[PDB]
Amino acid sequence: TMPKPQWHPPWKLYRVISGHLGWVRCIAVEPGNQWFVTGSADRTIKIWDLASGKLKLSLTGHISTVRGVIVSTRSPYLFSCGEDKQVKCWDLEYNKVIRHYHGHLSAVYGLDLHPTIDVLVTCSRDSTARIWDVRTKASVHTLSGHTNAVATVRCQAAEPQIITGSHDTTIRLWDLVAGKTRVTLTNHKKSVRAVVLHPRHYTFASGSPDNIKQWKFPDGSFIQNLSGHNAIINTLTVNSDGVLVSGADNGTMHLWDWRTGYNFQRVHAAVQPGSLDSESGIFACAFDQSESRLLTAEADKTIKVYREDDTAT
Amino acid sequence: EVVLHEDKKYYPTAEEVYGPEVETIVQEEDTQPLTEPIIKPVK
Amino acid sequence: NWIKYAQWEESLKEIQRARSIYERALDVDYRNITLWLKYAEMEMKNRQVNHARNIWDRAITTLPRVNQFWYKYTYMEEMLGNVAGARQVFERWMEWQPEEQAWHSYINFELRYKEVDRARTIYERFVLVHPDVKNWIKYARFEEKHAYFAHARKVYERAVEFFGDEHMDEHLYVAFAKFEENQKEFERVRVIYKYALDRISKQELFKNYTIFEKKFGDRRGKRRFQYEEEVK
Amino acid sequence: AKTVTKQRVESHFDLELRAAVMHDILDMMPEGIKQNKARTILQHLSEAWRCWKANIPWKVPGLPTPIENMILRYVKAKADWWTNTAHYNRERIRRGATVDKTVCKKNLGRL
Amino acid sequence: FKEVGIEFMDLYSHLVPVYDVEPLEKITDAYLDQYLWYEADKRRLFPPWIKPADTE
Amino acid sequence: IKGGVWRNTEDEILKAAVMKYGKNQWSRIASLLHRKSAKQCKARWYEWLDPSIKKTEWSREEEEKLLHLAKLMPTQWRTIAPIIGRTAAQCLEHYEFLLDKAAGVDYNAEIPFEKKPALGFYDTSEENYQAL
Amino acid sequence: AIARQGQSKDKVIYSKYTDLVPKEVMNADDPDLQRPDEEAIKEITEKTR
Amino acid sequence: QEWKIPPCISNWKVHINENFAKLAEAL
Amino acid sequence: QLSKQYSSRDLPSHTKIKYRQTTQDAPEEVRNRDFRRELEERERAAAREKNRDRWDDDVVFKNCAKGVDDQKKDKRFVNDTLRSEFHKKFMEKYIK
Ligand SMILES: [Mg+2]
């Protein structure tokens, strides 16, 4: 601590939305807080009104579980990737797929967009990640490297443009133009499933079953180790307010002070009306543009929305 | 007392499990039927 | 499969082939510690000292945490006679701040030669790396064993000074008492026993009892007033 | 490069389910350090899935609870996939769109 | 009695249950049925309003 | 024609076959026997030969329970039989007994692919090795 | 020097224990961690493109 | 010991209500 | 060593990139926006909308259908494939 640091208000569960038939694996939010999107084992992509929570639109077209979803900022596109092998670009102008990026050898676990260049980055079970030219559907680069499935990939503008982690427990930092690794971090003992980049600080964090590490940029000096909540943890996500959220396979969610590793709140959430206790835990979660709502994707086939409590102190 | 297998509850009400403060809504179907554009073009 | 193949070529004394097999196996799985041990072992069996030396260095560089590599590496150098080399290795090893046992082995290494000053120096670093009462006690005991009683006393003073009133207990204070007891400073022992006890937490209860017992023993080494006070 | 397809879909889904469980749990469960029951945990997976197909309650006398909650989770997922597929196919046949020799018999067995 | 096999005939809309019995119990039951209906018709058990009727 | 009385030979061979192949494969077990079918083998296992079946006299509790239940659900033997832990035919016989008594060169020429070991702070020049 | 052996001097490789050990703090911010700048990014982006 | 895994040797590769009494005795 | 082989799929298509426009929701607007206010007011509006929205002298039996008001079984969503109400309906429909 510094001095019993940064008092943040607790969050409460605000709303529960049903209406997937499979596990919801992925949530993304549109650039204007208008609509947020979900990928599912159902094989659909659904778009939901952020405000009312009503379902706007169901897309169909993936053959298998949709694993990853991104809404572009500078172009009216979704990108999605699946267990199928296929990464698709939907033109939201017509709600149809206009391009498909072909070439991974197995399931694609993850994807992300460069914020200024117009290039798409994807992770696959086949141990590679790819840099795809959005415009020409072309494998600009293939990032060989890890020995297992690559799980989560993040993309950034500055130095180490591509931050990625895999089930082989090691993080590599990829120099985009070379398509080679600058830094290998090996400090997690078990699979790295999630990483997240801090909006302002120029730092990044990684999560493993065992614990969560922050990193300096570049070159990933070690900084801190947040220890607390031990599960296979699938999600790390961060507000500009310094609120770091950790999801987990056992259902648990913890909120953290980015600076200190003060874990202010622990949320264990009820599973859905039917369901089973074991089908608990959050596959993924996100923050609307206003930082006022936390959305979670859960194995109980729901979407939960959390709202920061106004009486708090 | 007796409940036919016609009804017979399994699982508590959706609302009850979460608690009152949160709103639980089941979206099925959808609205804004697809010919609508998410992101509407300029003219 | 890799290993059996390597072994067969080794047996035919085609050790250049064997080397390539081991390297190929390492390419597949560099973390596997049996593989590395078999590789280094093979070199040593064929008297290929410098190959083995290279290999050991690689093993500790890439898998520093594996203590088996370090123990074997120092052993090999010792057998070869290269005390300096072994010392160097141990100094590298200690940078990883390893485990109580590793530090003990380093100290013992030094103590197979006279090198008492070296040993003491190692202990000085060790008791701060792993600042456990027990380690401090051990350090003091080391001095006692080699008759540096002046220094042993000083070590005890340092230990109690360092730990402070905040946290210290039974074991260390008992050990210090025993030391002074053996030094034939009975009055001093009582002073220490009383003053340091009152200065700190006392009663935890078990520890206190132990301390009391020790005190009683010391005293032994009209006068059953607390027999009545404890009962009453 | 090969493209998912109707011939390959069932095989595909089970392939990437075996992989899903394998990566997740062996990167999740561990400390066996040698090899932890990968063949075995997967055999428990197929065993459980058969048991749910036969509607036989499946309880292993000894077992770690994270392993059990694991299997019950993924098995329920595959059950949801299989069942939803069954409903959908019966809708297609009902409307009389699909003429296939296999999907009719299979879909029958499912119902 | 022994276990009856079951299978579904597929009408492409609603499935139809189909049962399979060992032959012995099928002959037994069959005679039981012809007999029951015969006595029943003789004794005027079923009033006329039940009409999957033999007459028409 | 296939039907008939059960034989000690057929019954013991049924024991061994069930032991080897397992409970769920009946057609394989019927294949070994003569004059018997798969259905008959299965029902012959679960009805009688199955070791989990209890063959002995009925205690007083089992008679109380059997009579009570049989008065509860008349004529339903396959529902009652699991509740008392006995075979349906057996508890039937015992019930009628209670009422009855009641009244090519990439290998061998040239070293396939060669990695000469890397060379490190020591002298490997001198070393060579002996023949076999 | 063992590990580098294959590579050029330029290319980095971690090996000493010191590398592993943690470094603390760095304050709310310092010039030490920051995103090259607008202008560096523009240069990099253009050359890359 | 805890992570001993029972071998998955493959096999492929009840209570009653008292209302029945009240009913039956009623009839 | 790059092969002269081709494929149908690979050929040019959609060579132009649709940049977002100003009314579609260009990043310029987004940066300037106060989302939180917008999100609150929309929410409030939604809430308001919701609020606005809302003889036989002889027989065996006296009325069974007294308080039987359907029940929320179709409002419950159940994360269990065999006990979902959808599954029940499906099972009801297709088996005899
Ligand atoms: Mg074919």
PDB file of N, CA, C and O in Angstrom, chain I residues 21-78:
ATOM      1  N   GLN I  21     -18.064   6.973 -41.371  1.00  0.00           N
ATOM      2  CA  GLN I  21     -18.362   8.371 -41.579  1.00  0.00           C
ATOM      3  C   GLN I  21     -18.844   8.981 -40.300  1.00  0.00           C
ATOM      4  O   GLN I  21     -19.039   8.298 -39.263  1.00  0.00           O
ATOM      5  N   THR I  22     -19.066  10.279 -40.410  1.00  0.00           N
ATOM      6  CA  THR I  22     -19.393  11.124 -39.295  1.00  0.00           C
ATOM      7  C   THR I  22     -20.724  10.793 -38.621  1.00  0.00           C
ATOM      8  O   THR I  22     -20.868  10.914 -37.407  1.00  0.00           O
ATOM      9  N   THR I  23     -21.708  10.382 -39.394  1.00  0.00           N
ATOM     10  CA  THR I  23     -22.976  10.058 -38.785  1.00  0.00           C
ATOM     11  C   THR I  23     -23.055   8.589 -38.482  1.00  0.00           C
ATOM     12  O   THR I  23     -23.937   8.186 -37.708  1.00  0.00           O
ATOM     13  N   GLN I  24     -22.155   7.790 -39.081  1.00  0.00           N
ATOM     14  CA  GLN I  24     -22.056   6.344 -38.780  1.00  0.00           C
ATOM     15  C   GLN I  24     -21.486   6.129 -37.405  1.00  0.00           C
ATOM     16  O   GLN I  24     -22.086   5.395 -36.610  1.00  0.00           O
ATOM     17  N   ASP I  25     -20.354   6.786 -37.141  1.00  0.00           N
ATOM     18  CA  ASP I  25     -19.884   7.117 -35.772  1.00  0.00           C
ATOM     19  C   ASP I  25     -18.378   7.117 -35.781  1.00  0.00           C
ATOM     20  O   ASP I  25     -17.717   6.296 -35.148  1.00  0.00           O
ATOM     21  N   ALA I  26     -17.867   8.084 -36.514  1.00  0.00           N
ATOM     22  CA  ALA I  26     -16.460   8.349 -36.572  1.00  0.00           C
ATOM     23  C   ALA I  26     -15.884   8.625 -35.171  1.00  0.00           C
ATOM     24  O   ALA I  26     -16.534   9.246 -34.290  1.00  0.00           O
ATOM     25  N   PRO I  27     -14.636   8.188 -34.965  1.00  0.00           N
ATOM     26  CA  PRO I  27     -13.899   8.270 -33.681  1.00  0.00           C
ATOM     27  C   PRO I  27     -13.798   9.692 -33.083  1.00  0.00           C
ATOM     28  O   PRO I  27     -13.587   9.855 -31.866  1.00  0.00           O
ATOM     29  N   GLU I  28     -13.875  10.665 -33.984  1.00  0.00           N
ATOM     30  CA  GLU I  28     -13.827  12.067 -33.632  1.00  0.00           C
ATOM     31  C   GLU I  28     -14.966  12.427 -32.702  1.00  0.00           C
ATOM     32  O   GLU I  28     -14.760  13.199 -31.761  1.00  0.00           O
ATOM     33  N   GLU I  29     -16.150  11.917 -33.027  1.00  0.00           N
ATOM     34  CA  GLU I  29     -17.364  12.195 -32.273  1.00  0.00           C
ATOM     35  C   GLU I  29     -17.169  11.526 -30.885  1.00  0.00           C
ATOM     36  O   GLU I  29     -17.532  12.092 -29.828  1.00  0.00           O
ATOM     37  N   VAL I  30     -16.686  10.290 -30.974  1.00  0.00           N
ATOM     38  CA  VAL I  30     -16.606   9.405 -29.814  1.00  0.00           C
ATOM     39  C   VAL I  30     -15.734  10.012 -28.743  1.00  0.00           C
ATOM     40  O   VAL I  30     -16.119   9.999 -27.551  1.00  0.00           O
ATOM     41  N   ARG I  31     -14.588  10.555 -29.182  1.00  0.00           N
ATOM     42  CA  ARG I  31     -13.628  11.172 -28.269  1.00  0.00           C
ATOM     43  C   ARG I  31     -14.289  12.321 -27.508  1.00  0.00           C
ATOM     44  O   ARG I  31     -14.140  12.448 -26.285  1.00  0.00           O
ATOM     45  N   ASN I  32     -15.051  13.134 -28.254  1.00  0.00           N
ATOM     46  CA  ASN I  32     -15.725  14.268 -27.635  1.00  0.00           C
ATOM     47  C   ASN I  32     -16.901  13.970 -26.708  1.00  0.00           C
ATOM     48  O   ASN I  32     -17.159  14.709 -25.757  1.00  0.00           O
ATOM     49  N   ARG I  33     -17.608  12.897 -27.013  1.00  0.00           N
ATOM     50  CA  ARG I  33     -18.827  12.541 -26.294  1.00  0.00           C
ATOM     51  C   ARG I  33     -18.645  12.358 -24.779  1.00  0.00           C
ATOM     52  O   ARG I  33     -17.614  11.827 -24.336  1.00  0.00           O
ATOM     53  N   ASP I  34     -19.663  12.753 -24.006  1.00  0.00           N
ATOM     54  CA  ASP I  34     -19.833  12.280 -22.605  1.00  0.00           C
ATOM     55  C   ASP I  34     -20.834  11.132 -22.584  1.00  0.00           C
ATOM     56  O   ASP I  34     -22.069  11.321 -22.537  1.00  0.00           O
ATOM     57  N   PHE I  35     -20.267   9.938 -22.590  1.00  0.00           N
ATOM     58  CA  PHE I  35     -21.038   8.747 -22.731  1.00  0.00           C
ATOM     59  C   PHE I  35     -21.978   8.561 -21.538  1.00  0.00           C
ATOM     60  O   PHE I  35     -23.160   8.203 -21.718  1.00  0.00           O
ATOM     61  N   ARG I  36     -21.447   8.850 -20.337  1.00  0.00           N
ATOM     62  CA  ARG I  36     -22.122   8.513 -19.096  1.00  0.00           C
ATOM     63  C   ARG I  36     -23.478   9.203 -19.036  1.00  0.00           C
ATOM     64  O   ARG I  36     -24.447   8.604 -18.601  1.00  0.00           O
ATOM     65  N   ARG I  37     -23.524  10.466 -19.440  1.00  0.00           N
ATOM     66  CA  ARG I  37     -24.775  11.202 -19.410  1.00  0.00           C
ATOM     67  C   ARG I  37     -25.781  10.564 -20.378  1.00  0.00           C
ATOM     68  O   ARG I  37     -26.962  10.358 -20.036  1.00  0.00           O
ATOM     69  N   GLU I  38     -25.277  10.283 -21.577  1.00  0.00           N
ATOM     70  CA  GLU I  38     -26.085   9.705 -22.651  1.00  0.00           C
ATOM     71  C   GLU I  38     -26.661   8.354 -22.189  1.00  0.00           C
ATOM     72  O   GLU I  38     -27.785   8.033 -22.480  1.00  0.00           O
ATOM     73  N   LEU I  39     -25.780   7.560 -21.580  1.00  0.00           N
ATOM     74  CA  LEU I  39     -26.173   6.225 -21.130  1.00  0.00           C
ATOM     75  C   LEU I  39     -27.230   6.346 -20.048  1.00  0.00           C
ATOM     76  O   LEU I  39     -28.147   5.549 -20.003  1.00  0.00           O
ATOM     77  N   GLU I  40     -27.078   7.307 -19.150  1.00  0.00           N
ATOM     78  CA  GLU I  40     -28.041   7.472 -18.072  1.00  0.00           C
ATOM     79  C   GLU I  40     -29.403   7.880 -18.673  1.00  0.00           C
ATOM     80  O   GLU I  40     -30.447   7.335 -18.263  1.00  0.00           O
ATOM     81  N   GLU I  41     -29.398   8.878 -19.522  1.00  0.00           N
ATOM     82  CA  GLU I  41     -30.653   9.417 -20.009  1.00  0.00           C
ATOM     83  C   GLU I  41     -31.412   8.404 -20.834  1.00  0.00           C
ATOM     84  O   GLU I  41     -32.612   8.318 -20.754  1.00  0.00           O
ATOM     85  N   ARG I  42     -30.677   7.644 -21.647  1.00  0.00           N
ATOM     86  CA  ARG I  42     -31.287   6.562 -22.440  1.00  0.00           C
ATOM     87  C   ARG I  42     -31.958   5.546 -21.519  1.00  0.00           C
ATOM     88  O   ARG I  42     -33.084   5.120 -21.773  1.00  0.00           O
ATOM     89  N   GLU I  43     -31.239   5.199 -20.472  1.00  0.00           N
ATOM     90  CA  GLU I  43     -31.687   4.227 -19.473  1.00  0.00           C
ATOM     91  C   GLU I  43     -33.002   4.693 -18.853  1.00  0.00           C
ATOM     92  O   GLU I  43     -33.973   3.911 -18.731  1.00  0.00           O
ATOM     93  N   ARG I  44     -33.000   5.968 -18.478  1.00  0.00           N
ATOM     94  CA  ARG I  44     -34.168   6.597 -17.842  1.00  0.00           C
ATOM     95  C   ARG I  44     -35.369   6.516 -18.779  1.00  0.00           C
ATOM     96  O   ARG I  44     -36.481   6.164 -18.349  1.00  0.00           O
ATOM     97  N   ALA I  45     -35.109   6.843 -20.046  1.00  0.00           N
ATOM     98  CA  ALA I  45     -36.132   6.823 -21.087  1.00  0.00           C
ATOM     99  C   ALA I  45     -36.745   5.431 -21.203  1.00  0.00           C
ATOM    100  O   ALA I  45     -37.971   5.280 -21.268  1.00  0.00           O
ATOM    101  N   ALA I  46     -35.861   4.445 -21.222  1.00  0.00           N
ATOM    102  CA  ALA I  46     -36.245   3.033 -21.332  1.00  0.00           C
ATOM    103  C   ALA I  46     -37.165   2.653 -20.175  1.00  0.00           C
ATOM    104  O   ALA I  46     -38.213   2.012 -20.379  1.00  0.00           O
ATOM    105  N   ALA I  47     -36.746   3.069 -18.984  1.00  0.00           N
ATOM    106  CA  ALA I  47     -37.487   2.793 -17.753  1.00  0.00           C
ATOM    107  C   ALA I  47     -38.901   3.386 -17.853  1.00  0.00           C
ATOM    108  O   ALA I  47     -39.894   2.722 -17.517  1.00  0.00           O
ATOM    109  N   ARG I  48     -38.947   4.623 -18.321  1.00  0.00           N
ATOM    110  CA  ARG I  48     -40.213   5.336 -18.468  1.00  0.00           C
ATOM    111  C   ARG I  48     -41.133   4.605 -19.431  1.00  0.00           C
ATOM    112  O   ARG I  48     -42.327   4.441 -19.149  1.00  0.00           O
ATOM    113  N   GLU I  49     -40.550   4.155 -20.534  1.00  0.00           N
ATOM    114  CA  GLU I  49     -41.269   3.400 -21.564  1.00  0.00           C
ATOM    115  C   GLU I  49     -41.886   2.143 -20.957  1.00  0.00           C
ATOM    116  O   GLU I  49     -43.065   1.833 -21.193  1.00  0.00           O
ATOM    117  N   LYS I  50     -41.061   1.453 -20.178  1.00  0.00           N
ATOM    118  CA  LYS I  50     -41.463   0.216 -19.503  1.00  0.00           C
ATOM    119  C   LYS I  50     -42.659   0.478 -18.596  1.00  0.00           C
ATOM    120  O   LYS I  50     -43.641  -0.282 -18.600  1.00  0.00           O
ATOM    121  N   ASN I  51     -42.543   1.561 -17.837  1.00  0.00           N
ATOM    122  CA  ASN I  51     -43.584   1.982 -16.895  1.00  0.00           C
ATOM    123  C   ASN I  51     -44.897   2.218 -17.640  1.00  0.00           C
ATOM    124  O   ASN I  51     -45.963   1.770 -17.203  1.00  0.00           O
ATOM    125  N   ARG I  52     -44.777   2.926 -18.758  1.00  0.00           N
ATOM    126  CA  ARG I  52     -45.922   3.259 -19.607  1.00  0.00           C
ATOM    127  C   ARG I  52     -46.611   1.985 -20.083  1.00  0.00           C
ATOM    128  O   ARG I  52     -47.848   1.871 -20.027  1.00  0.00           O
ATOM    129  N   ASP I  53     -45.784   1.045 -20.528  1.00  0.00           N
ATOM    130  CA  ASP I  53     -46.253  -0.254 -21.021  1.00  0.00           C
ATOM    131  C   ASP I  53     -47.046  -0.972 -19.926  1.00  0.00           C
ATOM    132  O   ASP I  53     -48.125  -1.511 -20.173  1.00  0.00           O
ATOM    133  N   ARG I  54     -46.490  -0.928 -18.711  1.00  0.00           N
ATOM    134  CA  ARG I  54     -47.108  -1.497 -17.513  1.00  0.00           C
ATOM    135  C   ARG I  54     -46.078  -1.530 -16.365  1.00  0.00           C
ATOM    136  O   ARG I  54     -44.878  -1.308 -16.570  1.00  0.00           O
ATOM    137  N   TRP I  55     -77.309 -26.569 -14.107  1.00  0.00           N
ATOM    138  CA  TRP I  55     -77.646 -27.881 -13.566  1.00  0.00           C
ATOM    139  C   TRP I  55     -76.411 -28.742 -13.302  1.00  0.00           C
ATOM    140  O   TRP I  55     -75.713 -28.546 -12.310  1.00  0.00           O
ATOM    141  N   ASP I  56     -76.232 -29.794 -14.077  1.00  0.00           N
ATOM    142  CA  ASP I  56     -75.019 -30.559 -13.938  1.00  0.00           C
ATOM    143  C   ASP I  56     -75.053 -30.870 -12.459  1.00  0.00           C
ATOM    144  O   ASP I  56     -74.024 -31.132 -11.836  1.00  0.00           O
ATOM    145  N   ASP I  57     -76.259 -30.839 -11.903  1.00  0.00           N
ATOM    146  CA  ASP I  57     -76.456 -31.149 -10.492  1.00  0.00           C
ATOM    147  C   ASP I  57     -75.514 -32.258 -10.048  1.00  0.00           C
ATOM    148  O   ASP I  57     -75.128 -32.335  -8.881  1.00  0.00           O
ATOM    149  N   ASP I  58     -75.142 -33.113 -10.992  1.00  0.00           N
ATOM    150  CA  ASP I  58     -74.292 -34.262 -10.700  1.00  0.00           C
ATOM    151  C   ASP I  58     -72.928 -34.200 -11.364  1.00  0.00           C
ATOM    152  O   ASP I  58     -72.813 -34.225 -12.588  1.00  0.00           O
ATOM    153  N   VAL I  59     -71.893 -34.138 -10.534  1.00  0.00           N
ATOM    154  CA  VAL I  59     -70.520 -34.216 -11.000  1.00  0.00           C
ATOM    155  C   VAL I  59     -69.606 -34.713  -9.888  1.00  0.00           C
ATOM    156  O   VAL I  59     -69.913 -34.570  -8.706  1.00  0.00           O
ATOM    157  N   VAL I  60     -68.475 -35.284 -10.282  1.00  0.00           N
ATOM    158  CA  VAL I  60     -67.429 -35.693  -9.356  1.00  0.00           C
ATOM    159  C   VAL I  60     -66.825 -34.491  -8.644  1.00  0.00           C
ATOM    160  O   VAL I  60     -66.459 -34.545  -7.472  1.00  0.00           O
ATOM    161  N   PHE I  61     -66.613 -33.439  -9.428  1.00  0.00           N
ATOM    162  CA  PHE I  61     -65.684 -32.383  -9.061  1.00  0.00           C
ATOM    163  C   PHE I  61     -66.202 -30.949  -9.062  1.00  0.00           C
ATOM    164  O   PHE I  61     -66.862 -30.491  -9.995  1.00  0.00           O
ATOM    165  N   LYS I  62     -65.864 -30.261  -7.981  1.00  0.00           N
ATOM    166  CA  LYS I  62     -65.936 -28.815  -7.843  1.00  0.00           C
ATOM    167  C   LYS I  62     -64.703 -28.292  -8.563  1.00  0.00           C
ATOM    168  O   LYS I  62     -63.783 -29.044  -8.855  1.00  0.00           O
ATOM    169  N   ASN I  63     -64.696 -27.003  -8.840  1.00  0.00           N
ATOM    170  CA  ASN I  63     -63.783 -26.474  -9.824  1.00  0.00           C
ATOM    171  C   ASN I  63     -62.312 -26.719  -9.481  1.00  0.00           C
ATOM    172  O   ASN I  63     -61.826 -26.320  -8.421  1.00  0.00           O
ATOM    173  N   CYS I  64     -61.625 -27.404 -10.389  1.00  0.00           N
ATOM    174  CA  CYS I  64     -60.179 -27.528 -10.323  1.00  0.00           C
ATOM    175  C   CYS I  64     -59.488 -26.198 -10.686  1.00  0.00           C
ATOM    176  O   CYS I  64     -58.509 -25.811 -10.037  1.00  0.00           O
ATOM    177  N   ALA I  65     -60.001 -25.501 -11.706  1.00  0.00           N
ATOM    178  CA  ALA I  65     -59.338 -24.292 -12.253  1.00  0.00           C
ATOM    179  C   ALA I  65     -59.699 -23.037 -11.459  1.00  0.00           C
ATOM    180  O   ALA I  65     -60.460 -22.185 -11.922  1.00  0.00           O
ATOM    181  N   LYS I  66     -59.132 -22.929 -10.259  1.00  0.00           N
ATOM    182  CA  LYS I  66     -59.445 -21.843  -9.329  1.00  0.00           C
ATOM    183  C   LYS I  66     -58.391 -20.739  -9.428  1.00  0.00           C
ATOM    184  O   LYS I  66     -58.672 -19.637  -9.884  1.00  0.00           O
ATOM    185  N   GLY I  67     -57.182 -21.033  -8.975  1.00  0.00           N
ATOM    186  CA  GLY I  67     -56.146 -20.015  -8.882  1.00  0.00           C
ATOM    187  C   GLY I  67     -55.042 -20.300  -9.866  1.00  0.00           C
ATOM    188  O   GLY I  67     -53.945 -19.750  -9.752  1.00  0.00           O
ATOM    189  N   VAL I  68     -55.314 -21.154 -10.851  1.00  0.00           N
ATOM    190  CA  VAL I  68     -54.244 -21.652 -11.730  1.00  0.00           C
ATOM    191  C   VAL I  68     -53.908 -20.661 -12.845  1.00  0.00           C
ATOM    192  O   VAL I  68     -54.396 -20.774 -13.980  1.00  0.00           O
ATOM    193  N   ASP I  69     -53.057 -19.702 -12.493  1.00  0.00           N
ATOM    194  CA  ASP I  69     -52.655 -18.616 -13.394  1.00  0.00           C
ATOM    195  C   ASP I  69     -51.327 -18.918 -14.127  1.00  0.00           C
ATOM    196  O   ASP I  69     -50.352 -18.190 -13.940  1.00  0.00           O
ATOM    197  N   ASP I  70     -51.293 -19.987 -14.940  1.00  0.00           N
ATOM    198  CA  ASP I  70     -50.173 -20.318 -15.882  1.00  0.00           C
ATOM    199  C   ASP I  70     -48.807 -20.637 -15.248  1.00  0.00           C
ATOM    200  O   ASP I  70     -48.225 -21.705 -15.481  1.00  0.00           O
ATOM    201  N   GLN I  71     -48.309 -19.661 -14.492  1.00  0.00           N
ATOM    202  CA  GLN I  71     -47.020 -19.680 -13.808  1.00  0.00           C
ATOM    203  C   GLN I  71     -45.890 -19.307 -14.750  1.00  0.00           C
ATOM    204  O   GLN I  71     -45.926 -19.555 -15.965  1.00  0.00           O
ATOM    205  N   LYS I  72     -44.863 -18.720 -14.143  1.00  0.00           N
ATOM    206  CA  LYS I  72     -43.727 -18.178 -14.861  1.00  0.00           C
ATOM    207  C   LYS I  72     -42.719 -19.225 -15.356  1.00  0.00           C
ATOM    208  O   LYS I  72     -41.540 -18.922 -15.413  1.00  0.00           O
ATOM    209  N   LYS I  73     -43.165 -20.422 -15.753  1.00  0.00           N
ATOM    210  CA  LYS I  73     -42.231 -21.460 -16.206  1.00  0.00           C
ATOM    211  C   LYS I  73     -41.574 -21.060 -17.518  1.00  0.00           C
ATOM    212  O   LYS I  73     -40.423 -21.404 -17.748  1.00  0.00           O
ATOM    213  N   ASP I  74     -42.289 -20.311 -18.359  1.00  0.00           N
ATOM    214  CA  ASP I  74     -41.719 -19.806 -19.617  1.00  0.00           C
ATOM    215  C   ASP I  74     -40.995 -18.454 -19.457  1.00  0.00           C
ATOM    216  O   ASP I  74     -40.516 -17.878 -20.435  1.00  0.00           O
ATOM    217  N   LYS I  75     -40.897 -17.967 -18.223  1.00  0.00           N
ATOM    218  CA  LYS I  75     -40.131 -16.762 -17.937  1.00  0.00           C
ATOM    219  C   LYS I  75     -38.777 -17.141 -17.366  1.00  0.00           C
ATOM    220  O   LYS I  75     -37.789 -16.485 -17.659  1.00  0.00           O
ATOM    221  N   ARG I  76     -38.752 -18.181 -16.529  1.00  0.00           N
ATOM    222  CA  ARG I  76     -37.515 -18.850 -16.136  1.00  0.00           C
ATOM    223  C   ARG I  76     -36.744 -19.307 -17.355  1.00  0.00           C
ATOM    224  O   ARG I  76     -37.293 -19.983 -18.224  1.00  0.00           O
ATOM    225  N   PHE I  77     -35.459 -18.952 -17.396  1.00  0.00           N
ATOM    226  CA  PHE I  77     -34.532 -19.541 -18.321  1.00  0.00           C
ATOM    227  C   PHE I  77     -33.723 -20.505 -17.511  1.00  0.00           C
ATOM    228  O   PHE I  77     -33.273 -20.188 -16.414  1.00  0.00           O
ATOM    229  N   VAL I  78     -33.508 -21.684 -18.047  1.00  0.00           N
ATOM    230  CA  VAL I  78     -32.778 -22.670 -17.294  1.00  0.00           C
ATOM    231  C   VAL I  78     -31.512 -23.106 -18.026  1.00  0.00           C
ATOM    232  O   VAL I  78     -31.542 -23.476 -19.190  1.00  0.00           O
TER     233      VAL I  78
END
